Amino acid sequence: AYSFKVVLLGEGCVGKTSLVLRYCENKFNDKHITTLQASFLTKKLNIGGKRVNLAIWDTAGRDSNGAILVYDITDEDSFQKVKNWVKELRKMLGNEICLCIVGNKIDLEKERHVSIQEAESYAESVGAKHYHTSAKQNKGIEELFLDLCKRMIET
Ligand SMILES: Nc1nc2c(ncn2[C@@H]2O[C@H](COP(=O)(O)OP(=O)(O)NP(=O)(O)O)[C@@H](O)[C@H]2O)c(=O)[nH]1
Ligand SMILES: [Mg+2]
């Protein structure tokens, strides 16, 4: 009965499709197969006795209730690029949209080049919540989507 549209955004190597494929199929690919077109899948959840249909839109590289802005923790450049989307989404929809700033590939912690403090403090500064995930190890994905849904219900 709750119906939310959520979009995944981020640079070309951050793992947008990998997050969705793991969450929805329990699968993961080492090959980067670049997304040529936006596509959706619907996740059904019950939260607080309420049914939720979550339309998750993956993107090729105004409607949305939430946006998942994915970066690669080993790639500083991928993190800074998130900030453009934040600026654009905030200009468009203000604080209405639930923003997630997601550091993916936490399995590659050994090669981290984005500071967690900067990531989290930046997230807070734009009214966003920060999240850590790995599509490869299936960590933090269940909770990302769940938390985003809870947050989208609060309005
Ligand atoms: N180690 C590790 N590699 C990951 C993780 N998530 C994705 N990758 C890798 O990152 C690469 C890009 O993944 P992909 O999901 O295709 O990214 P995308 O954001 O959809 N790219 P595009 O914009 O081209 O569609 C792949 O080689 C994939 O295996 C992760 O959590 N850990
Ligand atoms: Mg993709």
Domains of the chain: 1-155 (3.40.50.300)
| DSSP letter (8 states) at residue 155 | -
Fill in the amino acid letter for 63: D
Read out DSSP for 18-78? HHHHHHHHS---SS-----S-EEEEEEEEETTEEEEEEEEE------SEEEEEEETT-HHH
Residue 24 in contact with ligand 1 by CB distance below 6 A: no
**118, two tokens:** 């900067």
Q: Ligand 1 pocket test: which of 9, 14, 17, 18 has the largest number of ligand atoms within 8 Å of its C-beta?
A: 18
Q: Experimental technique used?
A: X-ray
Counting beta carbons within 10 angstroms of the beta carbon of residue 93, is it exposed (0 to 12), middle (13 to 18) or buried (19 or more)?
A: middle
- Number of Cβ within 10 Å of residue 15's Cβ equals 25
| Alpha-carbon distances, residue 138 vs 10, 21, 102, 123, 151 (angstroms) | 19, 10, 14, 23, 22
- Number of Cβ within 10 Å of residue 90's Cβ equals 16
Cα of 56 vs centre of ligand 2, distance in Å, is 13
Cα of 35 vs centre of ligand 2, distance in Å, is 4
Residue 65 in contact with ligand 1 by CB distance below 6 A: no
Distance, in Å, from the CA atom of 42 to the CA atom of 56, rounded to the nearest integer, reads 6
Ligand 1 closest atom vs CA 14: 19
Residue 9 in contact with ligand 1 by CB distance below 6 A: no
